[PDB]
Structure formats: structure tokens, C-alpha cells
PDB file of all heavy atoms in Angstrom:
ATOM      1  N   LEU A1177       3.268  -5.406 -10.699  1.00  0.00           N
ATOM      2  CA  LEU A1177       3.198  -6.825 -10.474  1.00  0.00           C
ATOM      3  C   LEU A1177       4.436  -7.646 -10.760  1.00  0.00           C
ATOM      4  O   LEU A1177       4.399  -8.779 -11.183  1.00  0.00           O
ATOM      5  CB  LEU A1177       2.062  -7.404 -11.305  1.00  0.00           C
ATOM      6  CG  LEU A1177       0.661  -7.591 -10.544  1.00  0.00           C
ATOM      7  CD1 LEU A1177      -0.030  -6.268 -10.379  1.00  0.00           C
ATOM      8  CD2 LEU A1177      -0.188  -8.559 -11.321  1.00  0.00           C
ATOM      9  N   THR A1178       5.603  -7.003 -10.521  1.00  0.00           N
ATOM     10  CA  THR A1178       6.867  -7.798 -10.721  1.00  0.00           C
ATOM     11  C   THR A1178       7.613  -7.943  -9.387  1.00  0.00           C
ATOM     12  O   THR A1178       7.782  -9.057  -8.858  1.00  0.00           O
ATOM     13  CB  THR A1178       7.748  -7.249 -11.809  1.00  0.00           C
ATOM     14  OG1 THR A1178       8.039  -5.855 -11.410  1.00  0.00           O
ATOM     15  CG2 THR A1178       7.022  -7.259 -13.156  1.00  0.00           C
ATOM     16  N   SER A1179       8.186  -6.851  -8.820  1.00  0.00           N
ATOM     17  CA  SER A1179       8.800  -6.912  -7.536  1.00  0.00           C
ATOM     18  C   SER A1179       8.268  -5.900  -6.528  1.00  0.00           C
ATOM     19  O   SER A1179       7.783  -6.380  -5.462  1.00  0.00           O
ATOM     20  CB  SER A1179      10.312  -6.578  -7.719  1.00  0.00           C
ATOM     21  OG  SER A1179      11.031  -7.057  -6.607  1.00  0.00           O
ATOM     22  N   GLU A1180       8.174  -4.661  -6.839  1.00  0.00           N
ATOM     23  CA  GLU A1180       7.638  -3.671  -5.983  1.00  0.00           C
ATOM     24  C   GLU A1180       6.238  -3.217  -6.458  1.00  0.00           C
ATOM     25  O   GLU A1180       6.006  -2.119  -6.866  1.00  0.00           O
ATOM     26  CB  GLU A1180       8.564  -2.450  -5.782  1.00  0.00           C
ATOM     27  CG  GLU A1180       8.150  -1.455  -4.706  1.00  0.00           C
ATOM     28  CD  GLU A1180       7.837  -2.083  -3.365  1.00  0.00           C
ATOM     29  OE1 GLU A1180       8.616  -2.887  -2.899  1.00  0.00           O
ATOM     30  OE2 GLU A1180       6.701  -1.810  -2.866  1.00  0.00           O
ATOM     31  N   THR A1181       5.373  -4.212  -6.486  1.00  0.00           N
ATOM     32  CA  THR A1181       3.985  -3.859  -6.829  1.00  0.00           C
ATOM     33  C   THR A1181       3.345  -2.868  -5.786  1.00  0.00           C
ATOM     34  O   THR A1181       3.152  -1.800  -6.145  1.00  0.00           O
ATOM     35  CB  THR A1181       3.123  -5.154  -6.914  1.00  0.00           C
ATOM     36  OG1 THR A1181       3.862  -6.215  -7.489  1.00  0.00           O
ATOM     37  CG2 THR A1181       1.881  -4.902  -7.687  1.00  0.00           C
ATOM     38  N   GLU A1182       3.192  -3.405  -4.554  1.00  0.00           N
ATOM     39  CA  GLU A1182       2.779  -2.634  -3.440  1.00  0.00           C
ATOM     40  C   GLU A1182       2.661  -3.532  -2.226  1.00  0.00           C
ATOM     41  O   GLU A1182       2.987  -4.723  -2.289  1.00  0.00           O
ATOM     42  CB  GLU A1182       1.436  -1.982  -3.694  1.00  0.00           C
ATOM     43  CG  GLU A1182       1.349  -0.512  -3.210  1.00  0.00           C
ATOM     44  CD  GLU A1182       1.036  -0.399  -1.738  1.00  0.00           C
ATOM     45  OE1 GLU A1182       0.294  -1.293  -1.173  1.00  0.00           O
ATOM     46  OE2 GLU A1182       1.554   0.506  -1.120  1.00  0.00           O
ATOM     47  N   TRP A1183       2.271  -2.946  -1.086  1.00  0.00           N
ATOM     48  CA  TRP A1183       1.914  -3.792   0.080  1.00  0.00           C
ATOM     49  C   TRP A1183       0.662  -4.670  -0.128  1.00  0.00           C
ATOM     50  O   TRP A1183       0.231  -5.314   0.754  1.00  0.00           O
ATOM     51  CB  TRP A1183       1.680  -2.920   1.298  1.00  0.00           C
ATOM     52  N   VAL A1184       0.100  -4.618  -1.389  1.00  0.00           N
ATOM     53  CA  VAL A1184      -1.129  -5.390  -1.634  1.00  0.00           C
ATOM     54  C   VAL A1184      -0.784  -6.851  -1.913  1.00  0.00           C
ATOM     55  O   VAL A1184      -1.652  -7.656  -2.221  1.00  0.00           O
ATOM     56  CB  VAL A1184      -1.784  -4.810  -2.888  1.00  0.00           C
ATOM     57  CG1 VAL A1184      -3.239  -5.325  -2.994  1.00  0.00           C
ATOM     58  CG2 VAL A1184      -1.805  -3.307  -2.883  1.00  0.00           C
ATOM     59  N   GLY A1185       0.467  -7.286  -1.649  1.00  0.00           N
ATOM     60  CA  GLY A1185       0.952  -8.568  -2.167  1.00  0.00           C
ATOM     61  C   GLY A1185       0.222  -9.776  -1.549  1.00  0.00           C
ATOM     62  O   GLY A1185       0.344 -10.871  -2.061  1.00  0.00           O
ATOM     63  N   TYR A1186      -0.558  -9.577  -0.479  1.00  0.00           N
ATOM     64  CA  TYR A1186      -1.266 -10.666   0.094  1.00  0.00           C
ATOM     65  C   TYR A1186      -2.205 -11.280  -0.907  1.00  0.00           C
ATOM     66  O   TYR A1186      -3.285 -10.635  -1.215  1.00  0.00           O
ATOM     67  CB  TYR A1186      -2.036 -10.201   1.385  1.00  0.00           C
ATOM     68  CG  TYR A1186      -2.478 -11.398   2.193  1.00  0.00           C
ATOM     69  CD1 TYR A1186      -1.579 -12.046   3.014  1.00  0.00           C
ATOM     70  CD2 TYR A1186      -3.829 -11.822   2.159  1.00  0.00           C
ATOM     71  CE1 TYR A1186      -2.024 -13.125   3.774  1.00  0.00           C
ATOM     72  CE2 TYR A1186      -4.226 -12.857   3.003  1.00  0.00           C
ATOM     73  CZ  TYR A1186      -3.331 -13.513   3.762  1.00  0.00           C
ATOM     74  OH  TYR A1186      -3.760 -14.575   4.511  1.00  0.00           O
ATOM     75  N   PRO A1187      -1.942 -12.528  -1.411  1.00  0.00           N
ATOM     76  CA  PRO A1187      -2.767 -12.967  -2.586  1.00  0.00           C
ATOM     77  C   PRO A1187      -4.075 -13.538  -2.287  1.00  0.00           C
ATOM     78  O   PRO A1187      -5.078 -13.311  -3.008  1.00  0.00           O
ATOM     79  CB  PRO A1187      -1.808 -14.016  -3.167  1.00  0.00           C
ATOM     80  CG  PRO A1187      -1.134 -14.559  -1.904  1.00  0.00           C
ATOM     81  CD  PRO A1187      -1.017 -13.524  -0.918  1.00  0.00           C
ATOM     82  N   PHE A1188      -4.224 -14.241  -1.159  1.00  0.00           N
ATOM     83  CA  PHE A1188      -5.360 -15.062  -0.939  1.00  0.00           C
ATOM     84  C   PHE A1188      -6.579 -14.250  -0.702  1.00  0.00           C
ATOM     85  O   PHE A1188      -7.702 -14.496  -1.242  1.00  0.00           O
ATOM     86  CB  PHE A1188      -5.095 -15.991   0.261  1.00  0.00           C
ATOM     87  CG  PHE A1188      -3.969 -16.924  -0.026  1.00  0.00           C
ATOM     88  CD1 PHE A1188      -3.100 -17.234   1.010  1.00  0.00           C
ATOM     89  CD2 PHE A1188      -3.731 -17.483  -1.256  1.00  0.00           C
ATOM     90  CE1 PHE A1188      -2.064 -18.099   0.831  1.00  0.00           C
ATOM     91  CE2 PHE A1188      -2.716 -18.340  -1.452  1.00  0.00           C
ATOM     92  CZ  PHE A1188      -1.844 -18.640  -0.382  1.00  0.00           C
ATOM     93  N   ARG A1189      -6.513 -13.174   0.148  1.00  0.00           N
ATOM     94  CA  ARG A1189      -7.707 -12.427   0.628  1.00  0.00           C
ATOM     95  C   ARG A1189      -8.276 -11.691  -0.517  1.00  0.00           C
ATOM     96  O   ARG A1189      -9.535 -11.404  -0.535  1.00  0.00           O
ATOM     97  CB  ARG A1189      -7.317 -11.581   1.777  1.00  0.00           C
ATOM     98  CG  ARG A1189      -8.490 -10.794   2.309  1.00  0.00           C
ATOM     99  CD  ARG A1189      -8.058  -9.773   3.375  1.00  0.00           C
ATOM    100  NE  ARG A1189      -8.995  -8.785   3.690  1.00  0.00           N
ATOM    101  CZ  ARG A1189      -8.768  -7.706   4.535  1.00  0.00           C
ATOM    102  NH1 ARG A1189      -7.619  -7.554   5.047  1.00  0.00           N
ATOM    103  NH2 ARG A1189      -9.752  -6.823   4.713  1.00  0.00           N
ATOM    104  N   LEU A1190      -7.496 -11.194  -1.504  1.00  0.00           N
ATOM    105  CA  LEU A1190      -7.963 -10.238  -2.502  1.00  0.00           C
ATOM    106  C   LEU A1190      -8.045 -10.855  -3.896  1.00  0.00           C
ATOM    107  O   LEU A1190      -9.026 -10.531  -4.645  1.00  0.00           O
ATOM    108  CB  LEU A1190      -7.056  -8.988  -2.505  1.00  0.00           C
ATOM    109  CG  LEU A1190      -7.292  -7.924  -3.572  1.00  0.00           C
ATOM    110  CD1 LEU A1190      -6.982  -6.565  -2.990  1.00  0.00           C
ATOM    111  CD2 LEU A1190      -6.379  -8.133  -4.717  1.00  0.00           C
ATOM    112  N   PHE A1191      -7.115 -11.678  -4.327  1.00  0.00           N
ATOM    113  CA  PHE A1191      -7.075 -12.150  -5.654  1.00  0.00           C
ATOM    114  C   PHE A1191      -8.237 -13.066  -5.946  1.00  0.00           C
ATOM    115  O   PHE A1191      -8.913 -12.959  -7.051  1.00  0.00           O
ATOM    116  CB  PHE A1191      -5.723 -12.928  -5.943  1.00  0.00           C
ATOM    117  CG  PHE A1191      -4.594 -12.010  -6.131  1.00  0.00           C
ATOM    118  CD1 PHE A1191      -3.308 -12.504  -6.073  1.00  0.00           C
ATOM    119  CD2 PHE A1191      -4.740 -10.697  -6.285  1.00  0.00           C
ATOM    120  CE1 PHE A1191      -2.201 -11.699  -6.187  1.00  0.00           C
ATOM    121  CE2 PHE A1191      -3.684  -9.806  -6.395  1.00  0.00           C
ATOM    122  CZ  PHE A1191      -2.375 -10.341  -6.340  1.00  0.00           C
ATOM    123  N   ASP A1192      -8.687 -13.882  -4.974  1.00  0.00           N
ATOM    124  CA  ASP A1192      -9.862 -14.696  -5.180  1.00  0.00           C
ATOM    125  C   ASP A1192     -11.101 -13.770  -5.109  1.00  0.00           C
ATOM    126  O   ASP A1192     -11.114 -12.748  -4.391  1.00  0.00           O
ATOM    127  CB  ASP A1192     -10.033 -15.734  -4.030  1.00  0.00           C
ATOM    128  CG  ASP A1192     -11.270 -16.576  -4.111  1.00  0.00           C
ATOM    129  OD1 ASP A1192     -11.270 -17.427  -5.013  1.00  0.00           O
ATOM    130  OD2 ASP A1192     -12.178 -16.326  -3.339  1.00  0.00           O
ATOM    131  N   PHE A1193     -12.107 -14.117  -5.879  1.00  0.00           N
ATOM    132  CA  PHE A1193     -13.301 -13.235  -5.978  1.00  0.00           C
ATOM    133  C   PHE A1193     -14.098 -13.443  -4.712  1.00  0.00           C
ATOM    134  O   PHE A1193     -13.763 -14.061  -3.736  1.00  0.00           O
ATOM    135  CB  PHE A1193     -14.135 -13.636  -7.228  1.00  0.00           C
ATOM    136  CG  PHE A1193     -15.137 -12.548  -7.610  1.00  0.00           C
ATOM    137  CD1 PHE A1193     -14.702 -11.262  -7.766  1.00  0.00           C
ATOM    138  CD2 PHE A1193     -16.445 -12.804  -7.847  1.00  0.00           C
ATOM    139  CE1 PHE A1193     -15.540 -10.255  -8.121  1.00  0.00           C
ATOM    140  CE2 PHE A1193     -17.298 -11.828  -8.227  1.00  0.00           C
ATOM    141  CZ  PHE A1193     -16.891 -10.512  -8.299  1.00  0.00           C
ATOM    142  N   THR A1194     -15.257 -12.768  -4.682  1.00  0.00           N
ATOM    143  CA  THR A1194     -16.151 -12.546  -3.538  1.00  0.00           C
ATOM    144  C   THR A1194     -15.509 -11.778  -2.460  1.00  0.00           C
ATOM    145  O   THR A1194     -16.163 -11.490  -1.409  1.00  0.00           O
ATOM    146  CB  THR A1194     -16.683 -13.886  -3.010  1.00  0.00           C
ATOM    147  OG1 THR A1194     -15.602 -14.566  -2.325  1.00  0.00           O
ATOM    148  CG2 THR A1194     -17.232 -14.786  -4.043  1.00  0.00           C
ATOM    149  N   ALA A1195     -14.312 -11.347  -2.607  1.00  0.00           N
ATOM    150  CA  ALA A1195     -13.660 -10.399  -1.627  1.00  0.00           C
ATOM    151  C   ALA A1195     -14.276  -9.002  -1.732  1.00  0.00           C
ATOM    152  O   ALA A1195     -14.386  -8.331  -0.751  1.00  0.00           O
ATOM    153  CB  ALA A1195     -12.132 -10.324  -1.841  1.00  0.00           C
ATOM    154  N   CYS A1196     -14.710  -8.617  -2.948  1.00  0.00           N
ATOM    155  CA  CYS A1196     -15.325  -7.315  -3.142  1.00  0.00           C
ATOM    156  C   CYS A1196     -16.806  -7.351  -2.737  1.00  0.00           C
ATOM    157  O   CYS A1196     -17.675  -6.894  -3.473  1.00  0.00           O
ATOM    158  CB  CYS A1196     -15.143  -6.864  -4.584  1.00  0.00           C
ATOM    159  SG  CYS A1196     -16.221  -7.695  -5.787  1.00  0.00           S
ATOM    160  N   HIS A1197     -17.123  -7.916  -1.601  1.00  0.00           N
ATOM    161  CA  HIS A1197     -18.420  -7.895  -1.075  1.00  0.00           C
ATOM    162  C   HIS A1197     -18.748  -6.479  -0.474  1.00  0.00           C
ATOM    163  O   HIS A1197     -19.905  -5.992  -0.640  1.00  0.00           O
ATOM    164  CB  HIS A1197     -18.634  -8.992   0.062  1.00  0.00           C
ATOM    165  CG  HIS A1197     -18.834 -10.355  -0.542  1.00  0.00           C
ATOM    166  ND1 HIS A1197     -18.715 -11.437   0.253  1.00  0.00           N
ATOM    167  CD2 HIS A1197     -19.115 -10.792  -1.830  1.00  0.00           C
ATOM    168  CE1 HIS A1197     -18.913 -12.520  -0.501  1.00  0.00           C
ATOM    169  NE2 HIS A1197     -19.128 -12.145  -1.774  1.00  0.00           N
ATOM    170  N   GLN A1198     -17.801  -5.824   0.068  1.00  0.00           N
ATOM    171  CA  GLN A1198     -17.913  -4.459   0.442  1.00  0.00           C
ATOM    172  C   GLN A1198     -17.584  -3.581  -0.761  1.00  0.00           C
ATOM    173  O   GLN A1198     -17.152  -4.067  -1.781  1.00  0.00           O
ATOM    174  CB  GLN A1198     -16.933  -4.145   1.647  1.00  0.00           C
ATOM    175  CG  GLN A1198     -15.492  -4.591   1.379  1.00  0.00           C
ATOM    176  CD  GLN A1198     -14.655  -4.398   2.589  1.00  0.00           C
ATOM    177  OE1 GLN A1198     -15.158  -4.149   3.724  1.00  0.00           O
ATOM    178  NE2 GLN A1198     -13.355  -4.557   2.398  1.00  0.00           N
ATOM    179  N   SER A1199     -17.830  -2.274  -0.584  1.00  0.00           N
ATOM    180  CA  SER A1199     -17.360  -1.296  -1.580  1.00  0.00           C
ATOM    181  C   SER A1199     -15.891  -1.252  -1.646  1.00  0.00           C
ATOM    182  O   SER A1199     -15.336  -0.936  -2.661  1.00  0.00           O
ATOM    183  CB  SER A1199     -17.946   0.036  -1.322  1.00  0.00           C
ATOM    184  OG  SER A1199     -17.849   0.403  -0.018  1.00  0.00           O
ATOM    185  N   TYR A1200     -15.191  -1.656  -0.534  1.00  0.00           N
ATOM    186  CA  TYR A1200     -13.734  -1.883  -0.484  1.00  0.00           C
ATOM    187  C   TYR A1200     -13.377  -3.214  -1.018  1.00  0.00           C
ATOM    188  O   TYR A1200     -14.268  -4.030  -1.488  1.00  0.00           O
ATOM    189  CB  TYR A1200     -13.226  -1.589   0.943  1.00  0.00           C
ATOM    190  N   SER A1201     -12.083  -3.551  -0.942  1.00  0.00           N
ATOM    191  CA  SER A1201     -11.597  -4.882  -1.374  1.00  0.00           C
ATOM    192  C   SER A1201     -11.833  -5.166  -2.821  1.00  0.00           C
ATOM    193  O   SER A1201     -11.887  -6.325  -3.217  1.00  0.00           O
ATOM    194  CB  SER A1201     -12.135  -5.974  -0.454  1.00  0.00           C
ATOM    195  OG  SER A1201     -13.467  -6.226  -0.689  1.00  0.00           O
ATOM    196  N   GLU A1202     -12.120  -4.086  -3.592  1.00  0.00           N
ATOM    197  CA  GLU A1202     -12.470  -4.266  -5.053  1.00  0.00           C
ATOM    198  C   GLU A1202     -11.214  -3.890  -5.907  1.00  0.00           C
ATOM    199  O   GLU A1202     -11.072  -2.741  -6.239  1.00  0.00           O
ATOM    200  CB  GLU A1202     -13.643  -3.475  -5.385  1.00  0.00           C
ATOM    201  N   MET A1203     -10.439  -4.850  -6.178  1.00  0.00           N
ATOM    202  CA  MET A1203      -9.259  -4.693  -7.050  1.00  0.00           C
ATOM    203  C   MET A1203      -9.689  -5.061  -8.513  1.00  0.00           C
ATOM    204  O   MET A1203     -10.594  -5.888  -8.723  1.00  0.00           O
ATOM    205  CB  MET A1203      -8.103  -5.528  -6.605  1.00  0.00           C
ATOM    206  CG  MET A1203      -6.781  -5.091  -7.075  1.00  0.00           C
ATOM    207  SD  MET A1203      -6.332  -3.440  -6.503  1.00  0.00           S
ATOM    208  CE  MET A1203      -4.725  -3.214  -7.267  1.00  0.00           C
ATOM    209  N   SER A1204      -8.941  -4.394  -9.418  1.00  0.00           N
ATOM    210  CA  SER A1204      -9.279  -4.642 -10.814  1.00  0.00           C
ATOM    211  C   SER A1204      -8.926  -6.088 -11.241  1.00  0.00           C
ATOM    212  O   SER A1204      -9.599  -6.722 -11.979  1.00  0.00           O
ATOM    213  CB  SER A1204      -8.463  -3.698 -11.723  1.00  0.00           C
ATOM    214  OG  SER A1204      -8.669  -2.372 -11.360  1.00  0.00           O
ATOM    215  N   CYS A1205      -7.811  -6.683 -10.631  1.00  0.00           N
ATOM    216  CA  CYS A1205      -7.462  -8.051 -10.969  1.00  0.00           C
ATOM    217  C   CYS A1205      -8.547  -9.036 -10.495  1.00  0.00           C
ATOM    218  O   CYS A1205      -8.812 -10.054 -11.132  1.00  0.00           O
ATOM    219  CB  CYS A1205      -6.122  -8.396 -10.336  1.00  0.00           C
ATOM    220  SG  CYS A1205      -6.119  -8.204  -8.537  1.00  0.00           S
ATOM    221  N   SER A1206      -9.247  -8.695  -9.414  1.00  0.00           N
ATOM    222  CA  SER A1206     -10.361  -9.549  -8.918  1.00  0.00           C
ATOM    223  C   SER A1206     -11.531  -9.516  -9.900  1.00  0.00           C
ATOM    224  O   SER A1206     -11.991 -10.627 -10.247  1.00  0.00           O
ATOM    225  CB  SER A1206     -10.815  -8.999  -7.516  1.00  0.00           C
ATOM    226  OG  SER A1206     -11.106  -7.611  -7.615  1.00  0.00           O
ATOM    227  N   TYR A1207     -11.980  -8.379 -10.298  1.00  0.00           N
ATOM    228  CA  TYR A1207     -13.065  -8.357 -11.293  1.00  0.00           C
ATOM    229  C   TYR A1207     -12.627  -9.047 -12.573  1.00  0.00           C
ATOM    230  O   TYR A1207     -13.509  -9.628 -13.291  1.00  0.00           O
ATOM    231  CB  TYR A1207     -13.532  -6.956 -11.544  1.00  0.00           C
ATOM    232  CG  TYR A1207     -14.432  -6.378 -10.421  1.00  0.00           C
ATOM    233  CD1 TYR A1207     -14.049  -5.287  -9.682  1.00  0.00           C
ATOM    234  CD2 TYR A1207     -15.648  -6.968 -10.107  1.00  0.00           C
ATOM    235  CE1 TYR A1207     -14.845  -4.721  -8.685  1.00  0.00           C
ATOM    236  CE2 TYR A1207     -16.468  -6.499  -9.137  1.00  0.00           C
ATOM    237  CZ  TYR A1207     -16.058  -5.395  -8.417  1.00  0.00           C
ATOM    238  OH  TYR A1207     -16.849  -4.864  -7.387  1.00  0.00           O
ATOM    239  N   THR A1208     -11.425  -8.877 -12.965  1.00  0.00           N
ATOM    240  CA  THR A1208     -10.898  -9.548 -14.149  1.00  0.00           C
ATOM    241  C   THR A1208     -10.963 -11.091 -14.030  1.00  0.00           C
ATOM    242  O   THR A1208     -11.366 -11.742 -14.913  1.00  0.00           O
ATOM    243  CB  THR A1208      -9.530  -9.085 -14.487  1.00  0.00           C
ATOM    244  OG1 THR A1208      -9.442  -7.660 -14.365  1.00  0.00           O
ATOM    245  CG2 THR A1208      -9.106  -9.490 -15.845  1.00  0.00           C
ATOM    246  N   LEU A1209     -10.522 -11.591 -12.861  1.00  0.00           N
ATOM    247  CA  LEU A1209     -10.628 -13.043 -12.595  1.00  0.00           C
ATOM    248  C   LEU A1209     -12.074 -13.509 -12.577  1.00  0.00           C
ATOM    249  O   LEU A1209     -12.363 -14.607 -13.023  1.00  0.00           O
ATOM    250  CB  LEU A1209      -9.964 -13.353 -11.280  1.00  0.00           C
ATOM    251  CG  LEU A1209     -10.176 -14.786 -10.785  1.00  0.00           C
ATOM    252  CD1 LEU A1209      -9.641 -15.858 -11.750  1.00  0.00           C
ATOM    253  CD2 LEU A1209      -9.550 -14.971  -9.363  1.00  0.00           C
ATOM    254  N   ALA A1210     -12.978 -12.679 -12.107  1.00  0.00           N
ATOM    255  CA  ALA A1210     -14.348 -13.002 -12.120  1.00  0.00           C
ATOM    256  C   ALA A1210     -14.933 -13.115 -13.517  1.00  0.00           C
ATOM    257  O   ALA A1210     -15.569 -14.092 -13.932  1.00  0.00           O
ATOM    258  CB  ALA A1210     -15.115 -12.005 -11.286  1.00  0.00           C
ATOM    259  N   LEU A1211     -14.677 -12.100 -14.320  1.00  0.00           N
ATOM    260  CA  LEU A1211     -15.073 -12.131 -15.728  1.00  0.00           C
ATOM    261  C   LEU A1211     -14.446 -13.405 -16.408  1.00  0.00           C
ATOM    262  O   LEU A1211     -15.118 -14.076 -17.219  1.00  0.00           O
ATOM    263  CB  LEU A1211     -14.685 -10.831 -16.455  1.00  0.00           C
ATOM    264  CG  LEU A1211     -15.204  -9.572 -15.973  1.00  0.00           C
ATOM    265  CD1 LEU A1211     -14.377  -8.416 -16.451  1.00  0.00           C
ATOM    266  CD2 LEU A1211     -16.602  -9.465 -16.555  1.00  0.00           C
ATOM    267  N   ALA A1212     -13.195 -13.672 -16.124  1.00  0.00           N
ATOM    268  CA  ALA A1212     -12.628 -14.887 -16.669  1.00  0.00           C
ATOM    269  C   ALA A1212     -13.406 -16.113 -16.287  1.00  0.00           C
ATOM    270  O   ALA A1212     -13.996 -16.667 -17.132  1.00  0.00           O
ATOM    271  CB  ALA A1212     -11.108 -14.980 -16.077  1.00  0.00           C
ATOM    272  N   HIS A1213     -13.440 -16.421 -14.990  1.00  0.00           N
ATOM    273  CA  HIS A1213     -14.176 -17.596 -14.529  1.00  0.00           C
ATOM    274  C   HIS A1213     -15.544 -17.722 -15.206  1.00  0.00           C
ATOM    275  O   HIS A1213     -15.973 -18.793 -15.565  1.00  0.00           O
ATOM    276  CB  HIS A1213     -14.311 -17.629 -13.007  1.00  0.00           C
ATOM    277  CG  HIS A1213     -13.063 -18.190 -12.344  1.00  0.00           C
ATOM    278  ND1 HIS A1213     -13.010 -18.352 -10.998  1.00  0.00           N
ATOM    279  CD2 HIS A1213     -11.886 -18.504 -12.836  1.00  0.00           C
ATOM    280  CE1 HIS A1213     -11.815 -18.819 -10.659  1.00  0.00           C
ATOM    281  NE2 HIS A1213     -11.083 -18.869 -11.772  1.00  0.00           N
ATOM    282  N   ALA A1214     -16.193 -16.547 -15.396  1.00  0.00           N
ATOM    283  CA  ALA A1214     -17.457 -16.558 -16.092  1.00  0.00           C
ATOM    284  C   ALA A1214     -17.392 -17.124 -17.479  1.00  0.00           C
ATOM    285  O   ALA A1214     -18.017 -18.100 -17.837  1.00  0.00           O
ATOM    286  CB  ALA A1214     -18.121 -15.173 -16.077  1.00  0.00           C
ATOM    287  N   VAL A1215     -16.473 -16.544 -18.237  1.00  0.00           N
ATOM    288  CA  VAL A1215     -16.369 -16.908 -19.658  1.00  0.00           C
ATOM    289  C   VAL A1215     -15.771 -18.343 -19.755  1.00  0.00           C
ATOM    290  O   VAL A1215     -16.022 -19.056 -20.696  1.00  0.00           O
ATOM    291  CB  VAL A1215     -15.515 -15.883 -20.504  1.00  0.00           C
ATOM    292  CG1 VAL A1215     -16.001 -14.521 -20.236  1.00  0.00           C
ATOM    293  CG2 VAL A1215     -14.051 -16.050 -20.174  1.00  0.00           C
ATOM    294  N   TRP A1216     -15.010 -18.748 -18.776  1.00  0.00           N
ATOM    295  CA  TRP A1216     -14.475 -20.059 -18.694  1.00  0.00           C
ATOM    296  C   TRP A1216     -15.576 -21.131 -18.527  1.00  0.00           C
ATOM    297  O   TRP A1216     -15.681 -22.119 -19.269  1.00  0.00           O
ATOM    298  CB  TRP A1216     -13.417 -20.244 -17.666  1.00  0.00           C
ATOM    299  CG  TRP A1216     -12.131 -19.509 -17.916  1.00  0.00           C
ATOM    300  CD1 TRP A1216     -11.741 -18.282 -17.453  1.00  0.00           C
ATOM    301  CD2 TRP A1216     -11.033 -20.022 -18.704  1.00  0.00           C
ATOM    302  NE1 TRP A1216     -10.485 -17.967 -17.885  1.00  0.00           N
ATOM    303  CE2 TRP A1216     -10.007 -18.985 -18.685  1.00  0.00           C
ATOM    304  CE3 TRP A1216     -10.798 -21.225 -19.412  1.00  0.00           C
ATOM    305  CZ2 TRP A1216      -8.822 -19.181 -19.339  1.00  0.00           C
ATOM    306  CZ3 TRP A1216      -9.628 -21.337 -20.026  1.00  0.00           C
ATOM    307  CH2 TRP A1216      -8.673 -20.343 -20.036  1.00  0.00           C
ATOM    308  N   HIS A1217     -16.431 -20.846 -17.554  1.00  0.00           N
ATOM    309  CA  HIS A1217     -17.505 -21.848 -17.268  1.00  0.00           C
ATOM    310  C   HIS A1217     -18.498 -21.869 -18.430  1.00  0.00           C
ATOM    311  O   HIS A1217     -18.988 -22.931 -18.791  1.00  0.00           O
ATOM    312  CB  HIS A1217     -18.220 -21.558 -15.938  1.00  0.00           C
ATOM    313  CG  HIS A1217     -19.099 -22.619 -15.491  1.00  0.00           C
ATOM    314  ND1 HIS A1217     -20.385 -22.793 -15.990  1.00  0.00           N
ATOM    315  CD2 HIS A1217     -18.894 -23.690 -14.594  1.00  0.00           C
ATOM    316  CE1 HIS A1217     -20.936 -23.833 -15.395  1.00  0.00           C
ATOM    317  NE2 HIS A1217     -20.047 -24.398 -14.539  1.00  0.00           N
ATOM    318  N   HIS A1218     -18.867 -20.709 -18.950  1.00  0.00           N
ATOM    319  CA  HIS A1218     -19.882 -20.714 -19.995  1.00  0.00           C
ATOM    320  C   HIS A1218     -19.394 -21.325 -21.272  1.00  0.00           C
ATOM    321  O   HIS A1218     -20.097 -22.133 -21.929  1.00  0.00           O
ATOM    322  CB  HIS A1218     -20.348 -19.273 -20.248  1.00  0.00           C
ATOM    323  CG  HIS A1218     -21.232 -18.687 -19.266  1.00  0.00           C
ATOM    324  ND1 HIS A1218     -20.739 -18.205 -18.064  1.00  0.00           N
ATOM    325  CD2 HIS A1218     -22.596 -18.520 -19.221  1.00  0.00           C
ATOM    326  CE1 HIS A1218     -21.765 -17.733 -17.312  1.00  0.00           C
ATOM    327  NE2 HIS A1218     -22.896 -17.931 -17.999  1.00  0.00           N
ATOM    328  N   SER A1219     -18.147 -21.025 -21.681  1.00  0.00           N
ATOM    329  CA  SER A1219     -17.608 -21.521 -22.942  1.00  0.00           C
ATOM    330  C   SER A1219     -16.863 -22.854 -22.777  1.00  0.00           C
ATOM    331  O   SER A1219     -15.923 -23.067 -23.547  1.00  0.00           O
ATOM    332  CB  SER A1219     -16.653 -20.452 -23.511  1.00  0.00           C
ATOM    333  OG  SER A1219     -15.339 -20.615 -22.999  1.00  0.00           O
ATOM    334  N   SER A1220     -17.226 -23.684 -21.762  1.00  0.00           N
ATOM    335  CA  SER A1220     -16.503 -24.911 -21.472  1.00  0.00           C
ATOM    336  C   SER A1220     -16.975 -25.984 -22.450  1.00  0.00           C
ATOM    337  O   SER A1220     -17.248 -27.091 -22.001  1.00  0.00           O
ATOM    338  CB  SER A1220     -16.701 -25.285 -20.050  1.00  0.00           C
ATOM    339  OG  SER A1220     -18.055 -25.113 -19.645  1.00  0.00           O
TER     340      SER A1220
END
């Protein structure tokens, strides 16, 4: 995640959650953002 991360650099389609609706499109950063938003809304 600095310069040569990968060709995965397209941020919008994958970094936002609900992209992992298929068994594909499931990146670790996505599930991490989801867990985040969860704990953010609950502990607000």
C-alpha cells in the first residue's frame, strides 16, 4: 500500500463495503472498514 501495491489500486469499487456481495471482491481492507464502521456507529 505505498507505491507498487498491485493493480488493485482502483479504490472506489473495492475499498467501499458491500463490494463483497459475491465470494469474489472480498478484500481484507474491505472487511476491516466494515468492522470499523460497525464499531464507529455503535460506540458513537
Side-chain angles (χ1 to χ4, degrees), residues 1177-1182 1184-1199 1201 1203-1220:
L1177 265 74
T1178 57
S1179 198
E1180 189 48 50
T1181 319
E1182 221 278 327
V1184 195
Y1186 194 77
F1188 300 141
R1189 181 185 165 189
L1190 174 146
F1191 286 167
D1192 178 75
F1193 199 50
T1194 70
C1196 75
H1197 282 166
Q1198 52 187 10
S1199 45
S1201 72
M1203 202 62 177
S1204 306
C1205 58
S1206 52
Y1207 282 119
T1208 313
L1209 169 61
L1211 300 162
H1213 278 184
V1215 312
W1216 289 98
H1217 191 280
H1218 285 81
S1219 89
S1220 44

